Structures are given as structure tokens and as C-alpha cells.
Design a protein around this ligand. Sequence first.
Ligand SMILES: [Mg+2]
Ligand SMILES: [Mg+2]
Ligand SMILES: [Mg+2]
Ligand SMILES: [Mg+2]
Ligand SMILES: [Mg+2]
Ligand SMILES: [Mg+2]
Ligand SMILES: [Mg+2]
Ligand SMILES: [Mg+2]
Ligand SMILES: [Mg+2]
Ligand SMILES: [Mg+2]
Ligand SMILES: [Mg+2]
Ligand SMILES: [Mg+2]
Ligand SMILES: [Mg+2]
Ligand SMILES: [Mg+2]
Ligand SMILES: [Mg+2]
Ligand SMILES: [Mg+2]
Ligand SMILES: [Mg+2]
Ligand SMILES: [Mg+2]
Ligand SMILES: [Zn+2]
Lengths: 47, 115, 137, 176, 190, 76
Amino acid sequence: MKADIHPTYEAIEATCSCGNVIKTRSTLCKPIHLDVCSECHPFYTGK
Amino acid sequence: SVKKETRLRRARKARLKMRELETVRLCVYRSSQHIYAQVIAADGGKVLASASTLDKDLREGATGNIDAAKKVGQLVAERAKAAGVTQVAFDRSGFKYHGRVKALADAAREGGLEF
Amino acid sequence: MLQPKRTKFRKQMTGHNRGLAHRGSKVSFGEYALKATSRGRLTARQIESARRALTRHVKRGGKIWIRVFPDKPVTKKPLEVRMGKGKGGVEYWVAQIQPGKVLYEIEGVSEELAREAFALAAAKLPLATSFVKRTVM
Amino acid sequence: RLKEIYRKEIAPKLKEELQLANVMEVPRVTKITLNMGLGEAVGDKKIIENAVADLEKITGQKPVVTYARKSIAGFKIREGWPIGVKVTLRSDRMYEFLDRLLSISLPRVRDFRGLNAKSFDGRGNYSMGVKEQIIFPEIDYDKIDALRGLDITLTTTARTDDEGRALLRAFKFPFR
Amino acid sequence: DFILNAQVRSDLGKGASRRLRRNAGLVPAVVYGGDKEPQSVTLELREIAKLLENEAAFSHVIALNVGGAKETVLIKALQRHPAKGFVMHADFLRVVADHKLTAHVPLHFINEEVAVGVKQAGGEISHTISEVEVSCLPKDLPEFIEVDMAKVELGQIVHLSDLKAPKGVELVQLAHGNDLAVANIHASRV
Amino acid sequence: TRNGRDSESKRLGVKLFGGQAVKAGNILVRQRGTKFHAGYGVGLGKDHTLFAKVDGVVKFETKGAFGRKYVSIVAA
RNA sequence: GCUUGACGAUCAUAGAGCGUUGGAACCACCUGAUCCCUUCCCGAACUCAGAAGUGAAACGACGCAUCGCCGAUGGUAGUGUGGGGUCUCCCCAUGUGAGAGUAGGUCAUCGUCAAGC
RNA sequence: CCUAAAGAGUAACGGAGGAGUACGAAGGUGCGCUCAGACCGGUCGGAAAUCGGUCGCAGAGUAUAAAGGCAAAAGCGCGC
Ligand SMILES: [Mg+2]
Ligand SMILES: [Mg+2]
Ligand SMILES: [Mg+2]
Ligand SMILES: [Mg+2]
Ligand SMILES: [Mg+2]
Ligand SMILES: [Mg+2]
Ligand SMILES: [Mg+2]
Ligand SMILES: [Mg+2]
Ligand SMILES: [Mg+2]
Ligand SMILES: [Mg+2]
Ligand SMILES: [Mg+2]
Ligand SMILES: [Mg+2]
Ligand SMILES: [Mg+2]
Ligand SMILES: [Mg+2]
Ligand SMILES: [Mg+2]
Ligand SMILES: [Mg+2]
Ligand SMILES: [Mg+2]
Ligand SMILES: [Mg+2]
Ligand SMILES: [Zn+2]
């Protein structure tokens, strides 16, 4: 895993506008706000 | 598969060069669990001496690391002179001369037989 | 007439015509055939002349094959030209014929109609021919 | 992220669902190559330095630019000029990227109720063509440039398309 | 019927064979097969050429009488003069009751006149092949294979799979995944 | 005519045949490419010339994979 | 002698294809990337530290001629020497003798060393 | 290259093509790797760009004509 050429890879903060919060690594360093997530979409459920 | 047959194709040039030169070869086989060393006479046919981790004096549990290879390298040097052979050529058998193979060669140099 | 669409080389050496035709001596497609019994060479104008004289006599059904192809170019030196100064230009195309080669084949007609029609064709060819029938071996 | 779930329920349930006698022949996702063919920048070639950075942000792993294998001058190219950029992901980096593209942003583009299941090859490798790259986080709409159709490809230890689909039937994939 | 007389031949080579054909009216021949050492024989030219006029001369078993010894034999191959057309050589395959022999068998086209493609459509009949290669035990080797063209229309192709062979007879070429065409009906030339 | 050209011949081929006695430095084959390959006791020049490095006799053997033709020197 | 590894002999009668089977050891897949070493990115490959799991894949062993590959006997073609003809081509005496095809074979045979009985 | 007659050589105002250069790396060495093409799936290209998989065995390549060669590749890349 070659170093000193790749950026920081932190875990950030993923928060949805529907109230869903998931922890997953990314390259943002700041909390984000999701207008839509997996648990607030019809197509997965099938409406 | 592909891993082994790429290694055998990688080792061809050195082996044919040593048969052109008509010399004594030290061939090394490395596996994930053990390591092997042989002294093939001059033309691939006869084996003069050999040593490995499978002999009933090194089956202790750690046979796939560096210091395991250093023990067998010192051992093959002892058996080589018992057969009255020196001035050999090192065959890495397609493996990289970096790790367990490299430590094997150094013990042979320390053991007395000169490349 | 008949000639290759294109060739690797424009000219050829004269060569020699020896041996018998062990290959091409069977009736492979039709029921009756015209077979050469002497050696010579057909000039692709005798092949076309003998084909038209052969298909005209049938005029009602029947399938006809040609087993000879003229693929050998021959040169000719023009009149009032000395010897040398390079090889001549190609004038016509010819096919080498050895004894025992099948020239034409036909099926779908009676034995007598084929025998009459191959007689007309053989009168346009500069070599001896014969009439044969298809056999298993 | 997603490794913790694979060998807990996906691995044993597919062991029995496909009637696989041994353990290891269960289908498994091997690698993800993202890549994108920059058909443009042939006479311009001044977007490669930003495209590599654009693909940098959504991965966290440095990409490699590709070159022209042959000439075919009809497209005004020959060998030597860069045409494309690729990224390879394995082990934890590929899974932790997958969930972000599985459903953190994938439903968040415009449309579609899912992904078609007929775009498989004869062995079970799945590739998705995407018409846009603003889908992903880590890039804001203002600073982006002329948009590019970034691609996605999945490579699995599947012997056939249905086994690949069955493994992709799990992981909550938008299929139909 | 199918009986030949032959004598043992002990002089071999190009010169000896040419003197047989030129000065004695004989034909060199060979019998091999079964489980025996091959044997070289010689036989009359006017005797072999008389039997060859029979239609079932190659799909029939023949009683070969060499000296006084009688053995059962099938005609395998036949060398002919390329120009004059007479037989120069022939080789003979020994026949064993339980062993598959591979032979050429002629075809027979029946009721060609009542063909649907002929009377109504006015099309010609063309025989692409006139013999087929079979393989079977000697006890069920047919003298011919019969193919009918009653239910054949214009433009229709007859293949090897279409025709049916007697019981215990196999078509060789069909086994190798190659059903070459046998006959067809096509439009008139003019 | 526009054809009357040709180059001078090069006198290639086998110089010493199988069984002949050889000395070190003797030229055995003159070649374009390697129709024959250098066996034991035989060297190769930059124009693929085969020459004898030791004394003995020529052997000529077709062995190995690739069906190559080898020229070697053996002790009489 | 039976099984597995390493190195050779010989280069398809030894290859390919299809099927059955091998984990006690050996080998292979396998776990992780801290430490040597690495990716024109990726522990994919190379490398290191291993002992949870499997023989799935790979490899080996064993069966089958469908393909591939070998391949007679006899005849034919050509041909050195001497002599003839109807001499662009052939024939005779003597010596030599293919290629193709046919009957039919082939799922190899060995050597050195080290580990399990 | 053929003529040129299976060692070498061999003529014609015989049949066909090239040369009068290039390269400080296109040389040396160590290490590492295999092409063309086909098919399937995949965003603007769609027959052909980059990509993933299977087959493929040299039908690619070789600075430049043709012939003879090329797996220890003589083909391709990198450090010194
Ligand atoms: Mg190399
Ligand atoms: Mg002349
Ligand atoms: Mg011929
Ligand atoms: Mg003679
Ligand atoms: Mg000239
Ligand atoms: Mg000359
Ligand atoms: Mg010359
Ligand atoms: Mg040198
Ligand atoms: Mg013979
Ligand atoms: Mg032969
Ligand atoms: Mg053959
Ligand atoms: Mg010569
Ligand atoms: Mg000569
Ligand atoms: Mg002169
Ligand atoms: Mg000039
Ligand atoms: Mg070069
Ligand atoms: Mg060439
Ligand atoms: Mg190699
Ligand atoms: Zn939500």
C-alpha cells in the first residue's frame, strides 16, 4: 500500500434528512447531510 | 494455474546457462510451509547432497520463515563438503533473491562453500 | 474468356509437360465425362468454343461442369522484332493437359444424348479424347 | 462497512441456497475497476490533469492513465496519446467504496427504479454504464467541469450469470 | 457368382509387375486383414474385369480361391490406368464374422418420375452423390441403399439424415457430425 | 527491360560434415539465421556462424522440443 | 515395492477433449499487511508473519480413440548405368524406390535424491 | 529471391524487388512481461477508442527490400 501519494481516508459523518445515520469511511473530513438515503426511497420497497 | 508455470518460465535462462557452462548447481525450492536445497551434479541428472526442513531434526513448528532457512543453509554446506564439492552456482529457481532464498544463500557462503 | 482474376506474377517459364493425370481422372460430379487420352494444351478459346458447341446440343435441362482452368500465361514476340530485348508480352492463357484428364462432365441426360454432344465438343479440341462413365472404384 | 456482513449471512445462506456441497465455491466479489474513456481531449488534451483529480476524490486511491493500443486515425488518434483513466479496488477499499455507491448516492441522481439484470456476460461479471459523475459526494456542482460518463465494473468468482445475479440479489442491489 | 481364382506371387517389384501385365495378362493383388500376415497373389485381367461389371461388385463378399485354399474376402481398393481405364492392381480385405468392415455402397433413386417437384413444379433432379460409405458387420452388409424422392418438392434438399439405413448399418460420415447433401430439386437451366 | 540486377553469392552451407575431425576455431556452418543451433563445445558468431571451441568430431543431432537441429563436438 | 515433492532423460504412439477420484503427510488454495520487499494505482503479481478452514479452483492419478499424432504389406510416380522407339514424350535389362491412401496402433517409457507405510 | 539441375559455384538487352542510410539510445547489463484477432457485457464512439471476462498460439512484432531466423524470445518495459 504505497503511501505519501494518497490523501486522508477518514470515516466522516453521514446523516440523512429523514433521520438515517450511517458510519462509513470517505474522503470528506466533515459531516454531510443526505437529502435522501436508502431507507427513504420507494424503489427499494417498490411503490 | 499461472503462478507456478510463470515461475518455471522465469527460471529457464539461468538453468540452461549453467548447463552450457557445465558446472555444479545449487537449486532452491521454496514452499509456503518448508524450504529445500539440493546439489545437482553437472547436468541435471544426479543429486550429490541435499537438505531441507523435512528431516527428523527440524520438525519443530516454524519452518516457513527466515531463520528456518538459515539453519538448513548451514546444513547443506556441511553435507556438500562431505561429498567433496565446492565452487557451485546458485540457482534461485525463479524466486526473487530477496527473502528466505537470500538468507539460505548467505548461510551457504558462511558454511564454507563458495559460489 | 476463362483466366485468373489476378496473379502473383505476370509471366512464366515455358516448362515441360510430362507424366500421367493420376489426379483429376475420375468422374467426380456428373454421370458421363469427356476424358483426354493424349497430352497437349487447351488455349481457353478452344474451351469456350467446345462449351458452346456442347450446351447448345442439349438445350433441355442437364448440369454441365468444366474441370479445366487456363491459368498459365504465354507470351509472343511481335513481328519484325529481333531476338532478345526482354521477354514478350502476354497474349493468351492456356491449361496443361496430361493423358487421362477429365475435361467436361454432364448429368441429367441419356447416355446417347451425352455421347452425341461430346462428339461435337471433341471436334473443337486439338487432342484425342474419349467417352467414360462414372464408377464406384 | 460491508466485509462484516458477507461471511455472516451471505456466505452461509448462499451455501445452502445454491446447494453447494463445499464451502469455498460460493460466489465472491473479487475486484472493482471504475475507469472512464475520455473520448474527448484528443486535440485538446488539457482535461486529463483534472479528470485524474476528479476520479481521485471519489476513491481516495490514485488512478492510472491509459494509452492508445493502436492508431485507427479515423478517430484522429494514434498510439501514444492518453485516452482513458482506470482505478482498481480490492479488499477493504472496494467494499467501503461499494456502500457509498450501493445506496448512499446511487438512488440520488434523477430517475430509474433499479438496474437491469440482463447486462451480464456468460460467466457472471457485471458492469454498469453511468451517464454522469455528479452523483458522487466529495465534489460540489460548481467546481466540476464538462461532465463525463464514468463507468463501473464488477468482477466475481461466478461461473455463470445467474450465480452472479444471485450474489448480487443480496447486497440490496436495485435489480428488477 | 462372386468367385475368383488366384495364384501365389513371389516375384515383386516394378519390373516383375510390368512383365505380368505385358506378357501374361495377369494382375498383381494383395489379401490382408483378419488376423494373418498379408499375402501377395496374382489373377487374370479378363476375370476381374468381368466381375467388376456387376453392380454389387464392391458391396458384396467374394469367395477367393487362392491355389486350392478358399477364404471369404471383400474388395477394398482398386488401381486403374489413368488413360486406358483398365485395372492395374487390387487389394483384398479378409472378412471375419464378428468384426466391423467399412465399405462403399451404391445408392438407388426410385420413383423419380412421380416426384412432387417434377410433375407439378417442373424441376430437375440432381444426384449430389451416388455412393455412401458405411460400416457394419458382414452379416448385414447391404448391396445398396435405397433412397426415394416421391415426397420431394422444388428447392428441397435431401441429406444423409433423411435417408434410412437397414438395421445394424451405420453411415460413417453422419457419425462425424457431417450430413452432406444427397440430392435436390432445382429450377430448370432454361 | 528493367530487371538485370543480382547480388554476388555468399558461399553458405555446411563446411564440416558429421564425423570429420575438428580443431578449435574451425568454422562449421555459415548461416542466415539459425538453421542449426550451437550444441556442446560450439560457439555462435554475430552473423550466426558456428565455430568449434574444442577438438573432436561433428555429431549433428535433432533433439529437445521445438525440433531443433544441433551441432556439437564429441571426443573421438 | 505403494503415495507425494525437486531435478533430469526423451519431445505427441508421449498431445487435446470428456468423466471418476486424492488431503494422514506433501502441495495448493487460505488469514493479515506490524516488520524486509512491491504496484508507471491495487499485498492482483512479488514479499513477509502464520495455522483458523477447504480440496471448490489448480495440480496429480486413473478410464475412454470422438479429434490430433504414428502407420504397414502391395502397387504406382520418379531415378543411376547400358540399349532401343513412332523421339515436345516414352519402352526394355539391371539396381534403387517415394508422397498420398488402406489394414491397423497410441490415453507413454525411464533415471537420481528427500519425505510417509 | 528465382533461373541454378537437394554440397559450393554457374550465363543471357532472362523474371521480380531494394541500397548510396538510421540510432548516445534503437548500444551493454540486471530484473520483469507476452502479440494479432474473435465473442460477450459496459456512458457520449459504435464496425473499430478506454474497460472486464473467455478463447486464441504468433495468423503480431523486428528502424529500413527479400530470404533465412526469433521462448534463454533476437519481440516489449523499467533502473544503472
Ligand atoms: Mg528474461
Ligand atoms: Mg524455356
Ligand atoms: Mg500433380
Ligand atoms: Mg526400369
Ligand atoms: Mg534480369
Ligand atoms: Mg549469379
Ligand atoms: Mg544466387
Ligand atoms: Mg559474442
Ligand atoms: Mg513399399
Ligand atoms: Mg509411405
Ligand atoms: Mg501422413
Ligand atoms: Mg546449389
Ligand atoms: Mg547440384
Ligand atoms: Mg560463363
Ligand atoms: Mg537500381
Ligand atoms: Mg532491436
Ligand atoms: Mg521473414
Ligand atoms: Mg521462456
Ligand atoms: Zn433517508
